[PDB]
């Protein structure tokens, strides 16, 4: 269902805009990870 960001610890898929600072829900981890892409990557098997 989409997710622009993740949380450094609770893994809970966050996702907010501006003026939202940087915190998760209950896990005030001011960290947050950017979440992978859907544009699947191809790899040489070499």
């Amino acid at each position: 269902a989409t997710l622009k960001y993740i949380c450094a610890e609770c893994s809970s898929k966050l996702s907010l805009s501006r003026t939202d600072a940087v915190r998760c829900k209950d896990c005030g981890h001011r960290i947050l990870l950017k979440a992978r892409t859907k544009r699947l990557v191809q790899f040489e098997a070499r």
Binding site: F43, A45, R46
Partner: protein, 263 residues
């Protein structure tokens, strides 16, 4: 049948200890090289990654995937994607497989080649089936998953040769020896006190007659009688590695006579 002559000693699904005789060292070698580098095979040569929360990197995993030996019995009934007239890959030139794994249990979940699943149409040719030789039908250990981690990949096997990448090699090693009794004097034994006492006598010294003390050097003897042993990796029956070795070498020279021709 007049000419090169095979004389098998051991034989199994993995090795083929034999004795080539009545041939040029050059031919024993070219054949020896061909088996190592130019026998066609199928192998994963493209991995699309949907999900990898594993502890490894995509290219890291992908690299291993390619090293996983795949069924290449009817490899000739498959074409090189570069020759094929499709756009990229198709059933006429490629085998598609899938890998989906999830860390369900709390105990470490292992991912093996057996967990690979063919998704394309093999059209009746024995090809792409991940080789398995272990005593538990598991295959190669591709990765390990902790509870919660996931791995969703999509591979694409293609025909190739060792010259392009060692993953496409059907051979594992190739023992090769001649003149076990240093009679042609091709090598000069290094020693501290005694050549003979310091150098281990080889297997094949039994299959030959030790030179006699007073015989003058035989200067016209050439090199025939080569003791080989081929170890297959599984993607192909041992007997085949050899046979097709001779085959490809044969087609090679053929491609040349045909060059002078249409020249």
């Amino acid at each position: 049948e007049e000419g090169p002559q095979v004389k098998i000693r051991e034989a199994s699904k993995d090795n083929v200890d034999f004795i080539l005789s009545n041939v040029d060292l050059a031919m024993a070698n070219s054949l020896r090289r061909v088996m190592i580098a130019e026998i066609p095979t199928l192998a994963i040569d493209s991995v699309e990654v949907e999900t990898n929360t594993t502890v490894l990197a995509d290219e890291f995993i992908a690299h291993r995937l390619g090293l996983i030996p795949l069924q290449s019995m009817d490899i000739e009934q498959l074409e090189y994607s570069r020759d094929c007239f499709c756009e990229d890959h198709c059933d006429k030139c490629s085998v598609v497989l899938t890998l989906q794994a999830f860390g369900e249990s709390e105990s470490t979940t292992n991912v093996y080649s057996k967990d690979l699943v063919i998704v394309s149409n093999l059209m009746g040719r024995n090809i792409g089936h991940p080789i398995i030789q272990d005593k538990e039908g598991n295959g190669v250990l591709i990765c390990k998953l902790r509870k919660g981690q996931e791995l969703k990949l999509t591979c694409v096997a293609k025909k190739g040769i060792a010259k392009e990448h060692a993953k496409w090699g059907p051979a594992a090693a190739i023992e090769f020896e001649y003149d076990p009794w240093n009679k042609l004097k091709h090598t000069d034994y290094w020693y501290e006190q005694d050549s003979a006492k310091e150098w281990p006598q080889s297997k094949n010294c039994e299959y030959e007659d030790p030179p006699n003390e007073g015989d003058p050097f035989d200067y016209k003897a050439q090199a025939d009688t080569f003791y080989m042993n081929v170890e297959s990796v599984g993607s192909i029956p041992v007997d085949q590695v050899v046979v097709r070795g001779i085959d490809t070498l044969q087609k090679k020279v053929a491609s040349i006579l045909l060059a002078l021709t249409q020249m």
